[PDB]
Structure formats: structure tokens, C-alpha cells
Amino acid sequence: MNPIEFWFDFSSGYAFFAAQRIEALAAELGRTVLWRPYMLSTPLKRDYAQRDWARIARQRGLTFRPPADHPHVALAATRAFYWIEAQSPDAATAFAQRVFDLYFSDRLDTASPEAVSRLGPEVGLEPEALLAGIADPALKETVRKIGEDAVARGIFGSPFFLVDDEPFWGWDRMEMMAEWIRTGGW
Amino acid sequence: AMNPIEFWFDFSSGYAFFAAQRIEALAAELGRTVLWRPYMLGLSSTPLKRDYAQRDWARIARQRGLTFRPPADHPHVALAATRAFYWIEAQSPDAATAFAQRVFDLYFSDRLDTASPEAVSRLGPEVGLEPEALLAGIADPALKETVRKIGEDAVARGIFGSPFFLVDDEPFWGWDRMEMMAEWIRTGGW
Numbered sequence: 390m391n392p393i394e395f396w397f398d399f400s401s402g403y404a405f406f407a408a409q410r411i412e413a414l415a416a417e418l419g420r421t422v423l424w425r426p427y428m429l430s431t432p433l434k435r436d437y438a439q440r441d442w443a444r445i446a447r448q449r450g451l452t453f454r455p456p457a458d459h460p461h462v463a464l465a466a467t468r469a470f471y472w473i474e475a476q477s478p479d480a481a482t483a484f485a486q487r488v489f490d491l492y493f494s495d496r497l498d499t500a501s502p503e504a505v506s507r508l509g510p511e512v513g514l515e516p517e518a519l520l521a522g523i524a525d526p527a528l529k530e531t532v533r534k535i536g537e538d539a540v541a542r543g544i545f546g547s548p549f550f551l552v553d554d555e556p557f558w559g560w561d562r563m564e565m566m567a568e569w570i571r572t573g574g575w
Numbered sequence: 576a577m578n579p580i581e582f583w584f585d586f587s588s589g590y591a592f593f594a595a596q597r598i599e600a601l602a603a604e605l606g607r608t609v610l611w612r613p614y615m616l617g618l619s620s621t622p623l624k625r626d627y628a629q630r631d632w633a634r635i636a637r638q639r640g641l642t643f644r645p646p647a648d649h650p651h652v653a654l655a656a657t658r659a660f661y662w663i664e665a666q667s668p669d670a671a672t673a674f675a676q677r678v679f680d681l682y683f684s685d686r687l688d689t690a691s692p693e694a695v696s697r698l699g700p701e702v703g704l705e706p707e708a709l710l711a712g713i714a715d716p717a718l719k720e721t722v723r724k725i726g727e728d729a730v731a732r733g734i735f736g737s738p739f740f741l742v743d744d745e746p747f748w749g750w751d752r753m754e755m756m757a758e759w760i761r762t763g764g765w
């Protein structure tokens with residue numbers, strides 16, 4: 390009832406490294422994490438990001454491989470998360486971890502309903518049902534409200550963390566957020 | 576003075592301010608020097624983004640106990656001070672850094688209009704140069720073209736934002752990366 394909110398886009402390289410450390414960190418700090426996927430210029434700036442991600446991975450001993458036409462528009466994966474989530478928030482976190490993990494080993498088109506639905510029976514969900522659910526109008530309206538509520542609450546970018554109403558934007562802000570939680574704020 | 580950490584920034588940049596309070600000491604701890612390089616190239620979402628940054632600056636400033644009080648109409652187009660830095664460097668690099676240090680201190684305690692040539696020239700004596708000699712230099716069309724060109728060319732070489740640190744060819748963007756960068760210098764890399 391006082392979770393660390395974890396707002397991210399599945400196509401976010403920085404969210405990938407955050408996704409990954411967030412669970413253990415919140416455990417160390419004795420908090421829960423609420424995972425919240427939501428939808429989101431220069432060549433040289435994109436060239437830098439790539440260098441930075443590779444540089445982060447290399448240091449953490451992580452394998453990191455975005456697909457050739459990164460970033461995917463992860464609409465099917467984002468709809469799938471909230472579909473699962475309505476049934477079981479824990480299954481949804483699990484599903485989210487498997488998206489990041491497959492996406493960033495070059496193994497999942499997160500825009501494809503069909504490809505995303507192959508992740509289901511893995512959270513004990515039939516592809517058919519997941520497929521039906523994300524093709525359901527009420528869920529499509531639900532996911533849209535999630536992101537609009539995000540805008541309305543000042544949430545932008547990925548990863549974005551919200552703890553006790555204090556916002557922290559960025560992967561490199563996780564230790565500051567932790568220091569905020571431990572001290573109670575400054 | 577051979578392989579410095581290049582410190583690229585905009586004077587009106589809050590995050591560059593905090594880097595500026597830190598860079599020399601880190602560099603001196605690391606056994607490196609710093610090449611200071613100010614440049615002018617450094618419903619929607621940006622009201623949320625601006626509003627986040629000011630909140631973020633205020634808390635960074637509280638935590639470290641630094642003065643952070645931008646002019647009421649922040650950010651200023653810091654054209655005069657940037658030009659002044661390069662005019663100053665021509666005469667003395669060490670003085671250009673002193674001048675730059677001071678500009679940060681003064682701008683972010685609301686004591687300096689960095690868009691004003693007269694106001695900026697007044698920092699001349701503090702560095703050992705005379706205000707109207709400084710005002711002479713920054714009024715020259717060529718220096719104006721030369722300053723701008725440094726920024727333009729930096730952009731073409733893939734320098735963007737504020738602050739941006741280049742050490743031994745390795746780019747580190749943002750106040751947040753000062754920590755990783757230190758590690759990149761100490762460990763020789765990874």
C-alpha cells in the first residue's frame with residue numbers, strides 16, 4: 390500500500406537495466422515494487438545511448454542485444470501485461486521480466502500480439518485467452534487510461550520511479566531513490 | 576596540459592552548475608586536468624520535465640548544502656559570458672576557468688545576468704583583466720563567429736546536452752555520469 394512504482398516502456402534500454410535490479414533493491418530497502426508499463430532525435434545521440442547501454446552491460450556482466458529495428462512499439466506486450474495483471478499482479482511482474490529479457494536478447498517482437506501471446510503459458514495462461522484479452526475493447530480502454538493517468542500525475546520517461554510521491558527519473562537515480570527511502574528524505 | 580577531461584556545458588544549465596562545483600576536485604583526485612568548454616548549442620511533456628528538473632536541482636542542492644537560487648526568469652541566454660570565457664582563455668586559460676567558476680557561483684545565486692556584456696565584464700578585475708578591454712573583445716565580429724563555431728563543430732562531433740564529459744575519447748553525458756566517468760579513468764576502462 391506504499392509501493393515503489395516502476396514506470397517504464399518495454400522498449401527502454403535504461404528500463405532494462407533498472408528492471409533487473411529493482412526487485413532486489415526494494416527487498417533490501419524493505420519495500421514492494423509496482424510495475425507499470427506504459428507507452429512512449431539526433432543519430433549521434435542514439436549512437437551514444439547504444440554505447441552507454443553496451444558500456445553498462447559490459448560492466449555488470451549482462452548480455453544486451455536489442456533487435457535490429459529497435460525500439461519496437463510495445464503495444465501488444467503492454468496490453469498483455471495489464472490483461473494478466475487483472476487476474477494476478479504477480480504473474481504480471483513475472484511476464485514483464487520475461488518481456489525485457491526476451492526483447493533484449495533479440496528474441497521477441499513486443500509489437501506482435503501473436504509473438505507476445507507465446508509468453509503466456511508460462512504464467513499458466515493459454516495463448517488463446519491472452520490473445521482474446523488484448524483484443525478486448527474494455528482492456529484497450531483500461532491501458533489507455535493507465536497512461537493518461539500517468540501524464541496527469543507528472544510521470545514521463547523510462548525508467549521513472551515514484552516513492553511516497555517523490556519522483557526519480559532515470560536508471561542512474563536508483564541509488565538516490567534508495568538513499569531517500571533509507572533517510573526518509575532530505 | 577596534454578590529455579584533459581573535456582567539460583562541455585551551458586552556463587544556464589542547473590546540472591552543469593553542480594558538475595562545476597565538483598569537477599576540478601575529482602580531476603585532481605584522479606590525477607587529470609579539466610578543459611572547460613562553454614557552448615550555446617547545449618499540451619506537451621516539457622512543463623512536466625522543466626518542473627521535475629527544478630525540483631531535482633533543489634533537492635540536490637539541499638543534500639549537499641549548496642546555494643542554488645537561479646534568476647527569477649531562468650534560464651538566461653548566456654551569450655556574453657560564453658564569449659567572455661573564450662576571450663579570457665586567449666589571454667589566460669587559468670583565468671578563464673576562474674572566470675567560469677565565478678559565473679556559475681554568481682548566476683545560480685541570482686547575482687549575474689549572463690546575457691549582459693556590461694554585467695559580465697565586471698568580473699574582469701577578479702581575474703585580472705579590465706572590463707572595457709573585455710567588452711572590446713566580445714564585441715568583435717570574428718570572435719563572435721569563432722565562439723559560435725566551437726559550439727557548432729562540437730555538435731557535429733556528437734557533443735550534445737549539458738554537462739557532457741569527454742575523457743580519452745570516451746563520452747559521458749550528464750551530471751549523473753560523473754561517477755561512472757571517475758571509474759572509467761581509475762580502471763583504465765572496460
Ligand SMILES: N[C@H](CCC(=O)N[C@@H](CS)C(=O)NCC(=O)O)C(=O)O
Nearest residue numbers: 401402403404546547548559560561
Ligand atoms: N535512465 C536514465 C535516462 C532514462 C532515459 O532517458 N530513458 C529513455 C528510454 S531508455 C526515456 O526516458 N525515454 C525517452 C523520453 O524521456 O521521452 C539514464 O541513466 O540515462
Ligand SMILES: N[C@H](CCC(=O)N[C@@H](CS)C(=O)NCC(=O)O)C(=O)O
Nearest residue numbers: 588589590736737738748749750751
Ligand atoms: N542527464 C542529465 C542531464 C540532462 C538534462 O535534463 N539536463 C540538460 C541541461 S540542465 C541537458 O543535458 N540537456 C540535454 C539535451 O539537450 O538533450 C543529468 O543527469 O545531468
Ligand SMILES: [Ca+2]
Nearest residue numbers: 595596676680
Ligand atoms: Ca564554486
